[model samples]
Target chain A: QNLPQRYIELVVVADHRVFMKYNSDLNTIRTRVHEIVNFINGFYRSLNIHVSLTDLEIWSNEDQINIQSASSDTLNAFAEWRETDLLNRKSHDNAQLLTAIELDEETLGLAPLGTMCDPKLSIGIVQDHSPINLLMGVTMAHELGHNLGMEHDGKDCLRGASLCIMRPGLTKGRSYEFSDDSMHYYERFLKQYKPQCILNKP
Target chain B: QNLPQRYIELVVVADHRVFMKYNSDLNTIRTRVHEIVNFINGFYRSLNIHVSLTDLEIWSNEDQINIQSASSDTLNAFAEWRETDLLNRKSHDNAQLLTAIELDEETLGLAPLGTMCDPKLSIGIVQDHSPINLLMGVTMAHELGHNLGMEHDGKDCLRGASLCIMRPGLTKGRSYEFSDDSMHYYERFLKQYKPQCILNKP
Candidate 1:
């Protein structure tokens, strides 16, 4: 059977302290995500899958900085933080969150650019007023790939290049892509997970 | 500027019991990895990167079941186990170890299909001699993507199916591909870590 369409919600948390260093607007990140959304939705058009972002909101908490740091188990802290404060949304509205993003400034110790929790979440850490800012969208897309299930060094059959998104170093070009070898892994996953995210699946 | 070439080694260590149950042959798995390389190589070509396999070998650990079991932290156990036995290889030869694969029979509790570690060095752990064998190469490629730094959910700019190798389960077909969004992540990462894997480039 062909896979059903995918309608996912992505919520962004902007640590107030962290964004102050770069720029004070959460839309800065949202602009990047909007670009990726265009790219993602276009990409998903082929596999009988559809991806659309339902809602994007900002969260400003003093603890957000520490929550994103590597000093603690960031993934653990993120799960607990969200479950404690954010799960209520899922419970009250019955909206399944397919993925979430957090923008933090104090996590230079955690990751140079960002990190992704298992399943469906990513955190974009702070960057100096340098090339890292230019690379923010790329970093967000990379971490989100983890939430979707890509690995670091998968290869392409024809080109011998590393799958660009999965590579650890962020080298090569302004544009990005995954290897065809990776598509198989994602299809089966979405098949199972689509139901998990969409409460009102037809 | 174009990306430099990557020379890497992939060591596949098969648990004796698991392979025995799968019919005691490494070539079965080798055939799959070989196929993925073709796809991986093709993908890299667009990025102007070259990938070469420096080494591919198999290991037979006698207590394969216990090693694969979930009672232990398989990934940590693996890093420590390999560091003790295999780290010397890198130290003596002064060669960079790019990725490793462990074929286990007891890891169903760990991952239904498989799992990958972080940084340049990735380890692909297999599970008991069962359905996963049906997608051996796909599983390995998927984990390697994690090691390379891609996440669970990625979007191809032009296709519909998920990145075949990175999805959580082996639900898709034999073929695979990565999303454009993911490719962007991979390129920047390689730009930073290009020198780590390549030796001949100036």
Candidate 2:
């Protein structure tokens, strides 16, 4: 809201009270990434919005924030499926990148990255096939949007929509920032969430 | 491990769970979306993996198998961040979707999409912009990998980075899928974790 004043409003999430996403997987996240860049070009590129895949600081109890071996009581339960979660907890708590985790099935993965709602708080990783350090920066940005109350595919679910990251599915990641609609709301939301807003608030 | 096949793994948390998200504020989640995607693709591509995001089904209650929001003292502190998981325990002990909530900055509502280590069952809104459905499926896949008993992210952070998702900075997305090195361990892990394998040869 304070930068050059040329950039459109900071479009991320609508209400700081809610989180939304438009990109469910690779294609979606990729599509959302470009979309966000174009949308936020008013006075900057993704860098201004911090939508690049370089600004991430992931720490692990042991190493990279990816999937690993099982260490839980439930893994012994062939009788129950809850075993996986038991192990997931072990990994989640020991990591430094995130604190919370949502258990959902958006896609298939021996180790799925699922959807990481936030990069600064909680991270996304699969039980098996999620990668790391490659697209994580953008993923972190998208999730950061959620932490800030933004959804990837939140604008409209379609090809020509705002190309929002809040969208659930991705055609290669169109949204990496916010849509006009999201920007509008972000303009208002940032009035309260931005660092300057708080530091310079009345 | 069978490929081209969908594997469903169910995980149960102690009791009820509760999650809340910010609907309007989309800053943190938006900007970092691209980085996450790129990282995911990078790692997966190297490992020859495919990732996707699915729809979202948010329930005020625990009807949805993905996220179980609870309001328990234990979950609250660890998983739920309060006490007693709300999604697992109810006066009715019913299974229904509660009203969908946006994200909450307090809880980093967008974060807990993956299963956590704490007692709290997974709880958080499936952001309109998120791959709620797809992630659920992916989570199952990822966790299933763990259930197989795979361990270690390998020597390189990219090829064998298991400790990542087990711990993240929020939505690592699929930034670190398994590599040939990691796969070897996973293959063996699954062999060891299987039900029939753990049993005597009939």
Candidate 3:
């Protein structure tokens, strides 16, 4: 059966250390994810498109969603962890695995607060350890921007200037948002980009 | 008479380039810049080189040197404008002008998240508007790192792994702070490098 419309399904994978070293509660992180969802969805609204977050029930199943006793630096081990975690899940709604975000103590490298690789996965490292905590939401939004098929050049003018939320740098208090240019690519991808296997096999 | 100790005095100039279309409240920009200042000062705490913001009254008196009606591509116009602003100011507290920062709306050229030069001048753009906002604080800290005489090699990190706040690009969740190595130079500069004009008369 063809789907009526596409939506974003995001699962927050919290490592045990996230609870200990990252100092974020599982419940509160969801609240932040919800905020990221609403913010990104609103940007899509500017393009006259609709997207939704599958209900939290899927996320609440600790057994299904959590990366059990997993202990690797979230950056190096995420793809590996996600593959294993996906196989263990009883549900096979692979397409529903629209986005996965990792909340870890700290990344192993100088990685972005949040990073997106392609169609379905992203990582958000909470630098709760520093001043950057003040702008955590902004980081999540930018990574999700990538998930929505956005990239640096898409929003930049040939002269190397842009105001898109996808801009490579951010200024405090300045509302870097998605706009005319961003929609051009996102709208195209939503209709044409096909997913072969939303969940990569372990 | 010799002064008690040394510190940095930063001035945030919002110019025509920034004002022409960057609709920002001058008052609000100042507030944010103050936040950047305080945050940076604390980082320098490790060096025992104290820092402080110039008196609020000085920044408030726009007429003394407000370029409030000024407009130019700030990155291009800054040196010129700052020179004029310098000559116009009645005060001879030349050294008090320590550093000048531009809170412009946009930047031209390759468009670094934020940029700086020797002596005492830096510019932070909203990327006109971009993802660099995630790196906003990082850019400021990175550019300031240059002012202190630390370079990429002192930090000597690459491709995205760094502990030194002086790295070229920002990775989310990573703490960009001073290292024992960074202190080697930063401490040397504060004590040895005395400037004739902290505000870069040229």
Candidate 4:
């Protein structure tokens, strides 16, 4: 069966620390942002989904919202900012914040599971720790997969691959492709919830 | 000397044939657009320049403008549409059209040289032929390089690389990096023209 392709119009915000990590150069910041999104688009292309970046905001002067070391706190502040400020300025289906603030070393990223179109919760936060942009890109893709209703791959869900994208933790040599379990979860999420925001072509 | 990073806010439009070529799947079209721009961003990163995609429009229903086989005619129609229709709706510094129409055996892409901020002429058109998205991506980067005021490389412009990006025609195994001559041209363009629009952080 042919599934209608879905698009998630995304707007990404980079915190001040993330900007400084790139030596406060807007060109490199923006280029890295494009590369990260490009990597994400490749990751989801197999699922007939695309993440289209509509706007990118870099906190050059300072962090727009308080970025706490705790992932949950940062996520909360970001969600509030998105509802009150960002949504008023830009139109998008989901928002993601990339920051250099140290989120727990154990947790590279965090997102509310299955809240893609929700105005209050359809956002995620990821810590940019590595110099390699693809590493952070994978972290973003993992968090976004949660927003789209994918769960952490169970112990038996690898399906022969050594590392799946939805693994609970970021392991060395992570697989770029999603596991079979993730695909099943995505299909169930789409059919069950019918995220209408992603149905319309942007 | 440290130069300020500049950004070119870009908007891309895909023609009906382009949509058809991707089987009218919005996901693939959007993914491909992201990939093309990603490749282009990589090309210009060395010059401290970034092309941020502000919007992407696909002619899913029909051709938004007359996309003729002649590159100039198509570019003319696209420029008019961009000024009259697209600019009214979206804010961007440069606009590009990707068409599957057979433009010319000789010309793969066309743009007005040194028209970055011009409302009427800061636009380009590229023909998508090969299945390899990177090939079309290079064409876009070439046309966009023209918009940034880089001319075709001269006889002595190869520097060290066998093929420079600004060569008069595309060839096999085109170098991914811009030539020293192209770099000099960019520096001259920046110093002489000082495109004020690109100075602002997007």
Most accurate candidate by TM-score: 4
Candidates by TM-score, descending order: 4, 1, 3, 2
Ranking by lDDT: 4, 1, 3, 2
lDDT of each: 0.43, 0.29, 0.40, 0.80
DockQ of each: 0.02, 0.01, 0.01, 0.02
Q: Candidate 4: which docking quality band?
A: incorrect
> Which regions of candidate 2 deviate over 4 angstroms?
A1-48, A51-103, A107-138, A152-162, A173-177, A194-202, B1-202
Specify the highest-lDDT model's number.
4
| RMSD vs true structure, all candidates | 20.9, 26.3, 18.7, 13.2
Indicate the worst ten consecutive residues by lDDT in candidate 1 chain A: A91-100
The docking category that best describes candidate 2 is incorrect
Clashing pairs in 4: none
Query: TM-score for every candidate vs. truth?
Result: 0.38, 0.24, 0.33, 0.50
- Angstrom error of the Cα, residue B190, model 3: value is 3.8
Candidate 3 — which residues are off by over 4 angstroms?
A: A1-202, B1-5, B16-23, B55-76, B90-134, B154-162, B196-202
